[PDB]
Ligand binder design. Sequence first.
Ligand SMILES: CN1C[C@@H]2C[C@]2(C#Cc2cc3ncnc(Nc4cccc(Cl)c4F)c3cc2NC(=O)CCCN2CCOCC2)C1
Length: 277
Amino acid sequence: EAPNQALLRILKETEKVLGSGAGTVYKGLWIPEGEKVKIPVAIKESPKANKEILDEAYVMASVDNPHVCRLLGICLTSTVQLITQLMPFGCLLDYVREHKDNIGSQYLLNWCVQIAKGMNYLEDRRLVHRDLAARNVLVKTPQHVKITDFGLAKLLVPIKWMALESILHRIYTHQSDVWSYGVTVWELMTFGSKPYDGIPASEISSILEKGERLPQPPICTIDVYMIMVKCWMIDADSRPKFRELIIEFSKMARDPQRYLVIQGDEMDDVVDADEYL
Ligand SMILES: CN1C[C@@H]2C[C@]2(C#Cc2cc3ncnc(Nc4cccc(Cl)c4F)c3cc2NC(=O)CCCN2CCOCC2)C1
C-alpha cells in the first residue's frame, strides 16, 4: 500500500448548535489567521471516545473528491473537535422528508449519480465506508451532495443498511457498500421512509434469508427498482459496481420523467471550503 501523505491540520480555538445526540455538531466560522477569509464550517465534538473520533479524523483527512466530505482540521483545546465544510442544507434524510412535495425526478436521479461517484472514489482509495445511508449524505446545495461520516470506514451497527453477508459473517467489501447504496436510494425514492419499519433488527437477517426485500417505491419505474434489487442480490459479485451505477443513473438523469413518476414534477470575505485550497 502507498504511504498516506495527507496533511493533518491543527487549528487554534481562537481561529450555534446544529444537533446533538448519540455527539454535538455546531455551525461556525473559521478565519485562518493572516488570510482575509471566513470559511463556514461544521464542528463535531474519555480515552475511548478520543480514540474513535481520531480514527474518523484520519479517514476524513485522507479523502479529496467533489462528492466526499474532507476534514479541514482538528482542534485539541479540551475535547477533540473535527472541523469540516459546513453543509448548510443538512443531511439528505431530513432534507427529503422536509421538502418531499418539492423534489423532482431530476434531483433524485442526480443525487444517485453523485453518491455513486463518491462511493466509486472511495473504492478507488480502497476504503469501505460501512455506514452509507441517507443520514450520512449531506447537502451543500440541492444540486451538490457529498458522502460523510467515516467513523466506521476501513481499508478493504446499522443492521437495516447492511448486506446479508455482513450481518451473518462480518464480511465487508465494496460490494457490501453497494447493498447499503441500494437501501440509501430506496430512502431517497420513498422521501425518507424508514426501511423495514416496525421489524426489529434481530429479525432482519432471517427476513433477508427468506428472500424478502424492500418494496418498490410508488414513484419508481421498474427500471429504477430493478437497479435497487440488483444491489440486494446474495451473490456480492453479482451486484452492480459503483462505476456502473454512475453510468446507469446518468442515462436516466437525461430523461428523468421516463424513470421516476412524481405528481407535479413538471459577509464580505466569506469563501466556501471548496474554493479554499
Ligand atoms: C434540519 N436542518 C437543521 C440544520 C441546518 C440543517 C443542518 C445540518 C448539518 C450540517 C453539517 N455540515 C457538515 N458536517 C456535518 N456532519 C459531520 C459529519 C462528520 C464529521 C463532521 Cl466534522 C461533521 F460536521 C453536518 C451535519 C448536519 N446535520 C445532519 O447531518 C443531520 C442528519 C441526521 N441525523 C444524523 C445522525 O443521527 C440522527 C439524524 C438542516
